[PDB]
Amino acid sequence: STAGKVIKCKAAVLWEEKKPFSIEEVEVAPPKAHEVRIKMVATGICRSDDHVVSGTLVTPLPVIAGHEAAGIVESIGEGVTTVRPGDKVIPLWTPQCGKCRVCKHPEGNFCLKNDLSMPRGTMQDGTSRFTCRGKPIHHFLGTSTFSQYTVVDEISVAKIDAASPLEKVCLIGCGFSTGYGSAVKVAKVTQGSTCAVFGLGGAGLSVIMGCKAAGAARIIGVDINKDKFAKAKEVGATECVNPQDYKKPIQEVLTEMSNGGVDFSFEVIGRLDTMVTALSCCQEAYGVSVIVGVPPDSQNLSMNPMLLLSGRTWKGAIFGGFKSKDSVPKLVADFMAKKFALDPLITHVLPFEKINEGFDLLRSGESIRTILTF
Amino acid sequence: STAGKVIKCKAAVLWEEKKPFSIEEVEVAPPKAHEVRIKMVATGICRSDDHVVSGTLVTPLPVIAGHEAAGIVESIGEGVTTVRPGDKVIPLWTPQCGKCRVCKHPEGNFCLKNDLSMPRGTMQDGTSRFTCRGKPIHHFLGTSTFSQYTVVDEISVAKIDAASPLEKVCLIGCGFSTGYGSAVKVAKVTQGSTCAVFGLGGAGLSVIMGCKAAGAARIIGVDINKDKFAKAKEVGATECVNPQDYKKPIQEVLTEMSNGGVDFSFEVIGRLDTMVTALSCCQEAYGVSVIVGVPPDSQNLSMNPMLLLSGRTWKGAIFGGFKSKDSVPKLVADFMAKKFALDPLITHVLPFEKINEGFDLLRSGESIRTILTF
Ligand SMILES: NC(=O)c1ccc[n+]([C@@H]2O[C@H](COP(=O)([O-])OP(=O)(O)OC[C@H]3O[C@@H](n4cnc5c(N)ncnc54)[C@H](O)[C@@H]3O)[C@@H](O)[C@H]2O)c1
Ligand SMILES: NC(=O)c1ccc[n+]([C@@H]2O[C@H](COP(=O)([O-])OP(=O)(O)OC[C@H]3O[C@@H](n4cnc5c(N)ncnc54)[C@H](O)[C@@H]3O)[C@@H](O)[C@H]2O)c1
Numbered sequence A, B: 001s002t003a004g005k006v007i008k009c010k011a012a013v014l015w016e017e018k019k020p021f022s023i024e025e026v027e028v029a030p031p032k033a034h035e036v037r038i039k040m041v042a043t044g045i046c047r048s049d050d051h052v053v054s055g056t057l058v059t060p061l062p063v064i065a066g067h068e069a070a071g072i073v074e075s076i077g078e079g080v081t082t083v084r085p086g087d088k089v090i091p092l093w094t095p096q097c098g099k100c101r102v103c104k105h106p107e108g109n110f111c112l113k114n115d116l117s118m119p120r121g122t123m124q125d126g127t128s129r130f131t132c133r134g135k136p137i138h139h140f141l142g143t144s145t146f147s148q149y150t151v152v153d154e155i156s157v158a159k160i161d162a163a164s165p166l167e168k169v170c171l172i173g174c175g176f177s178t179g180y181g182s183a184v185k186v187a188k189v190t191q192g193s194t195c196a197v198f199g200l201g202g203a204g205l206s207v208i209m210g211c212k213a214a215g216a217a218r219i220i221g222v223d224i225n226k227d228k229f230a231k232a233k234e235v236g237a238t239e240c241v242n243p244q245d246y247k248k249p250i251q252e253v254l255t256e257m258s259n260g261g262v263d264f265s266f267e268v269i270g271r272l273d274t275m276v277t278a279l280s281c282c283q284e285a286y287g288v289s290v291i292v293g294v295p296p297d298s299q300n301l302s303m304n305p306m307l308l309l310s311g312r313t314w315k316g317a318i319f320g321g322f323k324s325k326d327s328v329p330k331l332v333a334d335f336m337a338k339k340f341a342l343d344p345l346i347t348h349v350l351p352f353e354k355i356n357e358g359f360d361l362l363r364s365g366e367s368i369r370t371i372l373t374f
C-alpha cells in the first residue's frame, strides 16, 4: 500500500527556462488534510505550459508544470469529502473554493484561491509536496500534472464519470473548456452571428467549436500558419485568412468581409497586437471581443479608447468562464453523451517519457494537442 | 414670414480654437428635403462643447458648436413626416437613420450617419446652412444648437411632449441621458451592487442617478474637486473620495474600500489615466467598467491585458447607449411623469448672450450645468 507514505516516481521537472524538461525521480509526500494524491493517467501539452518554459508565463522555478490532465485518486487526506480513492478525476488549475466573493458570484469563475495572478508555486498552505535531488520543487497552478503522481488541494480536483476515457477527457481540463466556454459562456455568441477567431490551435479550434454550437452563421479563422486552416474548417470555420497574404491590416480586411465588423472576435494567440486587432475588427457600436490568449509577462498593450467609446465591449476570461468544479463533470458528462467532440484536437499521442518531443511538435506548429500517457 | 426664406440671427461662432465664442449675426438657409429648421429655446453647456474649444475634440472650424438643446420647429423641408412647425423638439447629436446595421441592431445606437467618428461638420448632404460675414460655417455633430435658429436633418431630431419645460428637458439631449443610460442601459447596474463614478459633473451625477435608480447599494464618487461632493451625495453617492487626499493610487483605495473591487466603475472625466484606473478598481473576475468620457484627440492609453484576462468587462458608450430618436421622447415623458429629476444638474441659468460666462463657470469648477436661454 502507498496510502500515507511518500511515493517516489518520475516527473518532468523544469530546472531553468528555455531548457528541456528533465524526466527524473521525485518524492511525492502523502496528502495532508483536504488534499488529494492523484495517479496521473493522461496529460495534454497546452501552449501555457510552454509559456512557462519560455518565461512568457512567469511562475517560480524549478517547477513541475502541467495543468490539463486526468487521473485516478490514489489516496485522500483527512476531511476530504468530494473524492475517494479509485475515482477518475480532473485537476482544476482554476479552483472553486465555493467560499470566496468570486465563487459566490453567479458569473465569476476566477477563484481568489488561484495561483495564476500572483504565482507562489505551492499548495494552498504555502508548502510543496515535491522533492527532487533533495531539493523542494515548485507546483504549477496547484496541479503539476507532469508527474506520475501529484497532490492537489480538494478545491482543485473534480470527480468525473467513472467510465470516462481519460486520454480524451483530459482536454476538458483546459484547452477544450476554455475555448468552448469563451464562445458560449463569455462572449455568448448568437445565432446568425459572424465570428472571427485569431489563433487556430487547441484553444482556438475549441472557440470555433463553441461558435458553431452557438449557431454562428460565419466563423472566420485567422492564423499565420495556413496549415491550421484545414482543421479549422473541419470544426466549423466557414473561411480562413492569413494576415501575411494581405497588403493591408487584417482588422481592415475583416471589417470589409463582415461588411462593417464582426459580431464576436476572439484573441486566442497571446500577443498584444492581435488583442488590439481583434478588438478593432468587431463592430464599433455593438461588437464584442474576448481575450483568451496569455500575454507576455508584465507587458502593456497600447490602444485608442475611442474603440470602446463607440460602443464595443472588451473582456477576457480564465478557463472559459466556467466555475471549474461544477462544470468539469457536467462537461465530461456531455462528452460521454456525444454533445461535443475532442478527437479533432488530438493530433499526437506520446508516452510521458517523450514529453520533450511533444513540446517540439507544438513549437514546430505541427500539432494542436499531443496527449501524454503515463 | 421666415418660412422658405433665409433667416438672419445671432449665433455663437467659434472662429479659432482656444478663443471665446463670437456672438454675431449669421444667415440660416431654409431647410431642404428632409431637413428641419428649429428655433432654439434653451441649450445646456456640456463639457464636450468646451473640448472643441480646447482642441480635445477635433471638428472642422469655424463652427457653431452646441448639441444639448431643445427648441420649436419653425419650418420643415419637403418630405419631413416626423415633426411639424410649432413642435417642441430636441436635436440628436447621435442620429437614428433607422436603416443602417447599427440602428437595425437591437443594442446598437451609435448610428452610422453620425458625425463624431470622422467629423465633417456638414449636413448629411455635405454642405452647410450657416453663413457669417460671407463665410461658410461648420455644423457640429449635425446639431449646432448655439444659434437662435438651426437646421438639422430629420434623422437628427425628435418630437417631444408639447407640455415640456424646454429649459429643463434640454439636458435630455446629452448629459442626463448619457450618464443615466450608461448606468442602467450600458453597464446595467444591479440591485445591491457597489459602484464607483470618476468625475462628478453633469454626466457623472447622472451616472449616480442611474446607479441609484438601478438599486446600487454603494455609490462611491471620485473627484479631485471636493466642492463636487455635496451634490453627488444629494443625488445618491454614499461616499466621495478625493484622489489627492491619498498617498497611494486610488484604484488601491477603492479596492480596499470595496473589499476586493467594485461591481461597476464609470469613467466620466475624459482622461487616459482615470480610464485605466477605473477599469483596475472594479473586481478582477466579474467587474464591469464603462468609459463615458471623451478622451483627448489621437491619444492611446497603456494597459496590462491581464486586467481583462482575469474576467473584467470594459465597455464604452455614446449617448448612454440610447437609440436617440426612440428614447429621447420616452425620457421626456418619464421626466414629465416625475420618474427622475433634472433640477440637481442645473446650477446656473443665463441668457444665450452670456454663453462665454457659462463656459467660464464650467471651466472654473463652479457650475455643473448652465442652461442658456435664447
Ligand atoms: N485564458 C485561459 O484560460 C487560457 C487557456 C488556454 C490557453 N490560453 C492561451 O491561448 C493561447 C493559445 O493556446 P493554444 O494552446 O490554442 O495555442 P497554439 O500555439 O496551439 O495556438 C496559437 C496559434 O496562433 C497562431 N499565431 C501565432 N501568431 C499569430 C499571429 N501573429 N497571427 C495569427 N495567428 C497567429 C499560431 O500559428 C497558432 O496556430 C496561448 O497564449 C495560451 O496560453 C489561455
Ligand atoms: N459618451 C458620451 O456620449 C458623452 C456624453 C456627454 C459627455 N461626455 C464626456 O464625459 C466627460 C465629462 O463631462 P461632464 O459634462 O460631466 O463635464 P464636467 O467637467 O462638468 O465633469 C468632469 C468632472 O471630472 C473631474 N475631474 C477632472 N480630473 C479629475 C481627475 N483627475 N480625477 C478625478 N476627477 C476629475 C472634474 O472636477 C469634474 O467634476 C467629458 O469628457 C465629456 O466630454 C461623453
Ligand SMILES: [Zn+2]
Pocket: A046, A047, A048, A049, A067, A068, A174, A175
Ligand atoms: Zn492551458
Ligand SMILES: [Zn+2]
Pocket: A095, A096, A097, A098, A099, A100, A101, A102, A103, A111, A112, A113
Ligand atoms: Zn473561490
Ligand SMILES: [Zn+2]
Pocket: B095, B096, B097, B098, B099, B100, B101, B102, B103, B111, B112, B113
Ligand atoms: Zn442608422
Ligand SMILES: [Zn+2]
Pocket: B046, B047, B048, B049, B067, B068, B174, B175
Ligand atoms: Zn455632451
